[PDB]
Amino acid sequence: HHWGYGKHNGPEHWHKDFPIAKGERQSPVDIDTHTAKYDPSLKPLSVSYDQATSLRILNNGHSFQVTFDDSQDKAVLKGGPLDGTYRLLQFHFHWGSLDGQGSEHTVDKKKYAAELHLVHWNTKYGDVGKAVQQPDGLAVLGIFLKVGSAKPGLQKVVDVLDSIKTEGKSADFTNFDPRGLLPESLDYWTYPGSLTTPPLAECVTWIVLKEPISVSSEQVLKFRKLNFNGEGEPEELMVDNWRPAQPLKNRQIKASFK
């Protein structure tokens, strides 16, 4: 009885194995745009992805992820609300069964069709395992996806999904440039939160971009043909792998823009 997103092992059950699920800085949250506070002391984000080295793409049974070489300062995030340098480790997506759901964060209760998470870890802690134990260990860049025109920089990902259909499958995925996934603007909201999957550690500075990227209906359709199950088991489509919004409690959401 592992955790997942079904009726019997979904987000409402996770607290039994991970009691921090009911903690004080859980993610995702609804971003109320009229109560977020513009903070002029926030710096522009600095995204330096020019030397990124992607390694593999993997279906982990919960989402699919692209992993990067994080052994040096190749692809780093700095600035914004962050102190220090955060290395890119992986990206993955959360998506829905229908176009009106799929994101984890919401904006004035609006849900997007998917959400992209670029996960980075604070190099002062030496390895990612140490970083997850610290309140400033991780920085996740979140990007909303809406259905519209195709995103050409996503197509290399879509085209390899057939080869990682079921849980446990991986493939070589080199020379992918994550800059092709970013919107035009880097305006953002930020707040202190958590991982959105077990173990739900409260170690994340969230940086959620205001501007969504557009992807085509055919691109999102390919996400929805992945499988939660391993090869040989009964087919269960990988859809609706998102955690609902959690209480904000004693936290302020700050905006880099007004």
Which residue ranges make up the annotated binding site? 92, 94, 117, 196-197
**CB closer to Zn ion, 117 vs 222:** 117
> Within positions 108 to 127, which residues make up the interface with Zn ion, using CB under 5 A?
117
CB of 154 to ligand 3QR, least distance (A): 18
For the residues of 135-150, what is the DSSP string, one character each? TTSEEEEEEEEEESS-
Letters for 76-105 (x = contact with ligand 3QR by CB under 6 A, - = none) are: ----------------x-------------
Length, in residues, of the chain: 258
How far apart (Å, rounded) are the C-alpha atoms in residues 234 and 97? 19
* DSSP classification of residue 237: B
Q: Which of these, 127, 105, 129, lies nearest to 116 by C-alpha position?
A: 105
Among 26, 54, 197, 205, binds ligand 3QR (CB under 6 A): 197
Q: Are 3 and 17 in contact (CB under 8 A)?
A: yes
Q: Does 135 bind ligand 3QR (CB under 6 A)?
A: no
**CB closer to Zn ion, 60 vs 155:** 60
Among 88, 107, 114, 140, binds ligand 3QR (CB under 6 A): 140
Among 6, 19, 44, 129, binds ligand 3QR (CB under 6 A): 129
Of these residues, 2, 15, 62, 105, which one is catalytic? 62
* DSSP classification of residue 230: B
How far apart (Å, rounded) are the C-alpha atoms in residues 231 and 223? 17
3-state secondary structure of 156: helix
Longest dimension (CA), the chain: 55
Positions annotated as catalytic residues are: 62
Provide the binding-site residues for ligand 3QR, judged by CB under 6 A: 63, 92, 117, 119, 128-129, 132, 138, 140, 195-197
